Amino acid sequence: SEDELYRQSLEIISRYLREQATGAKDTKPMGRSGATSRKALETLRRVGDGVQRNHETAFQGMLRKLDIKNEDDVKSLSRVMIHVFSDGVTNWGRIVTLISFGAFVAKHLKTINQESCIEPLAESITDVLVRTKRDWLVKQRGWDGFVEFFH
Ligand SMILES: CC#CCn1c(CC)c(-c2cccc(Cl)c2C)c2c(N[C@H](Cc3ccccc3)C(=O)O)ncnc21
């Protein structure tokens, strides 16, 4: 390991997706740069909840199209994130939509009683995000850049 950016990203995304699914704020330290991952998570809650709320109908229609039922559909969803998220313009706007739709999908995984697929979903999203937009993420100062961008 010793990929700080991947570790920090996976943590923030797992916390958001897990707490959206279940309602509970997970109380367990944070990790390295914990004040930058707690301010990132705070921001993500504000802006991410906003995107799910404002574009609920769009999110519902996309979820319906993907027809997600098991670990096999979540594993596949990865090829879908590469086509849609990676093959686009790069900005925090689309990065939030990716993690917000992931949270929307994580809520659906809980309701269809497949909540063991949440942590893998979070890993899939972090994989596509960090190992297709690494160059851009580094240039923007990673999650310090994100928190700054949503002042
Ligand atoms: C988990 C995951 C994932 C991948 N992903 C997906 C899922 C395939 C979409 C997407 C594409 C079309 C419609 C909808 Cl509702 C969505 C969510 C997406 C995305 N969408 C925005 C457009 C948009 C913004 C806000 C609300 C609805 C739609 C875009 O393409 O610029 N941006 C980034 N990643 C996206």
From Swiss-Prot:
Post-translational modification (record): Cleaved by CASP3 during apoptosis.
Mutagenesis or variant effect for residue 25 to R: Reduced ubiquitination
Purpose: Involved in the regulation of apoptosis versus cell survival, and in the maintenance of viability but not of proliferation. Mediates its effects by interactions with a number of other regulators of apoptosis. Isoform 1 inhibits apoptosis. Isoform 2 promotes apoptosis.
Family: Belongs to the Bcl-2 family.
Motif BH3, residue range(s) on this chain: 40-54
Residues of the full protein shown: 171 to 320 of 350
Cross-link (Glycyl lysine isopeptide (Lys-Gly) (interchain with G-Cter in ubiquitin)): 25, 28
Record protein name field: Induced myeloid leukemia cell differentiation protein Mcl-1
Location of the motif BH1: 83-103
Induction per the UniProt record: Expression increases early during phorbol ester-induced differentiation along the monocyte/macrophage pathway in myeloid leukemia cell line ML-1. Rapidly up-regulated by CSF2 in ML-1 cells. Up-regulated by heat shock-induced differentiation. Expression increases early during retinoic acid-induced differentiation.
Record's subcellular location: Membrane; Cytoplasm; Mitochondrion; Nucleus, Nucleoplasm
